[PDB]
Amino acid sequence: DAPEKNYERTMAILQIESEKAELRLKELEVRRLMRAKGDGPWFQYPTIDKALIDHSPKATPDN
C-alpha cells in the first residue's frame, strides 16, 4: 500500500474509534444521570395505571 493510503486509512480508523469512545463516555454519563434522577425514558419502573380507578358515584358519599 501507499503511505498516502495507509495514512488516510489510519485517520479514518482514528475518527471512527474516537467517536465511539466519546459516545461510550456519554452513554455512561447518561445512564448515571437517568438512574439518579428518573426523568429520562430509561429506568422507568412502573406505577399504578390511573385508568383502573372507578370514578362513579359510590354507595357512600365521603370518598
Binding site: 465511539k20 459516545l23 426523568d39 358519599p61
Partner: protein
C-alpha cells in the same frame, strides 16, 4: 399539619325527627314523593362536596321538610297512620306485605284529605335531576398540583452510530 375546622354546637342544633324506624318506614313512600326536592338537593350537595361541614344547611332543610311532612299527617290522618305503623312495628323484619289493609286505609285517607299519590314500583329508585344555585366544587378532593410527565419520544429513528459500539464489534 393544619387544624381541622369543626363547626360549632350551635350550627348542629336542629329540631330532630324523634320518631321510630317503623314510623319512618310506614311513611317512607309518601316521604319520598312529597319531600323530594330538599332531600335530593341535600344528597346532591353531599355527593358533590364530599364534606358534611359543607352540607349542614341543606341538611337542616331536610330536617325542616320532614317535620312539615309529619305535621301534615298528624293534623289530618293520625288514626290510619298510627294504626298502620303499629302493624308495621309488630314485625321483626317490618314487612310491608303483612300490613296491606292498614296501608290501603292510610293511602285512602291520605289521597282523600291530602291528594298524595303513593309512588309506584320503580319510581323512588329513579335518578333525578336537581337544579341548585350553589356552585360546582372545582377541587372536591382538595388535590394539589400534579407532577409534570416525563418528556415523550419524538424524532425519526436514525441508525445506531457505528453499530453496537461493544468493545470491537463494528455492527
Amino acid at each position: 399539619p393544619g387544624i381541622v375546622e369543626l363547626p360549632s354546637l350551635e350550627d348542629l342544633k336542629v329540631q330532630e325527627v324523634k320518631v321510630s324506624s317503623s314510623v319512618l318506614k310506614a311513611a317512607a313512600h309518601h316521604y319520598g314523593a312529597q319531600c323530594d326536592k330538599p332531600n335530593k338537593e341535600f344528597m346532591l350537595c353531599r355527593w358533590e362536596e364530599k364534606d358534611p361541614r359543607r352540607c349542614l344547611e341543606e341538611g337542616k332543610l331536610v330536617n325542616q321538610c320532614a317535620l312539615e311532612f309529619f305535621r301534615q299527617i298528624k293534623r289530618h290522618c293520625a288514626e290510619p297512620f298510627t294504626e298502620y305503623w303499629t302493624c308495621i312495628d309488630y314485625s321483626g323484619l317490618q314487612l310491608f306485605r303483612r300490613c296491606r289493609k292498614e296501608q290501603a286505609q292510610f293511602d285512602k285517607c291520605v289521597l282523600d284529605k291530602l291528594g298524595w299519590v303513593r309512588p309506584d314500583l320503580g319510581e323512588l329508585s329513579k335518578v333525578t335531576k336537581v337544579k341548585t344555585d350553589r356552585p360546582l366544587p372545582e377541587n372536591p378532593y382538595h388535590s394539589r398540583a400534579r407532577p409534570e410527565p416525563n418528556p415523550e419520544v419524538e424524532g425519526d429513528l436514525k441508525p445506531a452510530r457505528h453499530g453496537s459500539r461493544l468493545f470491537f464489534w463494528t455492527m
